[PDB]
Amino acid sequence: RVQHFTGYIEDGRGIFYSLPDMKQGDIIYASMQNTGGNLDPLVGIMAEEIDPAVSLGQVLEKANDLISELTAVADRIFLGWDDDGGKGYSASLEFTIPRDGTYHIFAGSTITNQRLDKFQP
Amino acid sequence: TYTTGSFQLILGLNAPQVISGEGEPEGEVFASLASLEIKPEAHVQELEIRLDKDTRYLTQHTRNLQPGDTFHALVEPLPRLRLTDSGGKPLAFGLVELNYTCDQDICELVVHVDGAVYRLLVGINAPNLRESGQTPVGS
Ligand SMILES: [Ca+2]
C-alpha cells in the first residue's frame, strides 16, 4: 500500500494529511525529499490535529541553543518524527500504530542554519 | 620518497580469480580492520585568536570526520561558542566547552567563536583536552 503526494511549503507553513481509522499493529512508513528550492524536510505523526506553528515559533524566539530545544519541543508535539534519516537532509520514519483509531501526518520545514559568515536560524 | 593517495584492496580466500583483479564479493567475510580492536589515535591543535573591534566573529573549518569519531573543543581567555556543519545546521552549543559525535558517513564541521585575545583548543578522539600534557600531536 503506497501513495504519492506533492506540495509546496511557504515560510514554514506545514501541511496536514489524514490517516483515517488505522488498526493496532500496523506499521507506517514515511519519506520526504526536496525537489526544488532550499527546503529542509521534517515529518511528524500525531493523534489530535494541532498546528505546531505556535510552539515551534518559540524555538526561533530563543535565538545547545537549537538542537536540544528543537528535540525537546518535538518530543512533546509529536509521537514520532525524523529530521535527516535519509539521503542528505531528507527524512524517513517508521512508526508502529499504538492503538486503534485515526492519526495525522505533519509535513513541513525544520529550523536550520545555512550560512558560514554568521549564525541565523 | 614515499607516496600518498587512495587505494582499493581486494582479498580472496581459495578464490584464484582474485589475482586477475576482477573478483566480485562473494561468500561470508573472513578478515576485518585491525585498528578497530583498540583506541583511535588522537589529534590535538591549539590556536590563539583575537577579536578586534571590526572582527568580532570568527569561523574555522575542520577536516572530514569518519563515522563513530568524536569532537571536543574549549576556549579560555567569555565569548559564545557553537558548532555547525558546512551548510550551517547547528549540531552542538557551548556550556566554555563543547562535544559532538559523528553519525553520518562524512561530516564536515565549522567552529564558530563570537563575542581581547583568547586561547582555542581543539581535538579529535581526544577527550583529555582538559589536561593534554603532550605538545599538539597528530595532524
Ligand atoms: Ca532535515
UniProtKB/TrEMBL annotation, chain B:
Segments passing through the bilayer: none
Disulphide linkage map: C102-C107
Top-level taxon in the UniProt lineage: Bacteria
The protein, known as: Uncharacterized protein
Organism per entry: Desulfofustis sp. PB-SRB1
